[PDB]
UniProtKB/Swiss-Prot annotation, chains A, B:
Residue numbers carrying ADP-ribosylarginine: 17, 27
Designated name of the protein: Neutrophil defensin 1
Residues of the full protein shown: 65 to 94 of 94
Protein source organism: Homo sapiens
Disulphide-bonded residues: 5-33, 7-22, 12-32
Taxon lineage: Eukaryota, Metazoa, Chordata, Craniata, Vertebrata
PTM-bearing positions, type Phosphotyrosine: 24
Length: 33, 33
């Protein structure tokens, strides 16, 4: 629980920060932790 | 708990499935959940 990350379009959730980009299912996403 | 996934080189660990790819700090990683 915690210490991990997610992919989100268009942006990360308030409280999180964008650390890079995901490539998933042929779309680009924000990589958020 | 936030995100549940990680970026790993070279591959995911036990208990995980690869969902895509991360672009992080100028390189490519396995996106694992």
């Amino acid at each position: 629980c915690g210490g991990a990350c997610y992919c989100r379009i268009p942006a990360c959730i308030a409280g999180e920060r964008r650390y890079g980009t995901c490539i998933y299912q042929g779309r680009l996403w924000a990589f958020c932790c």
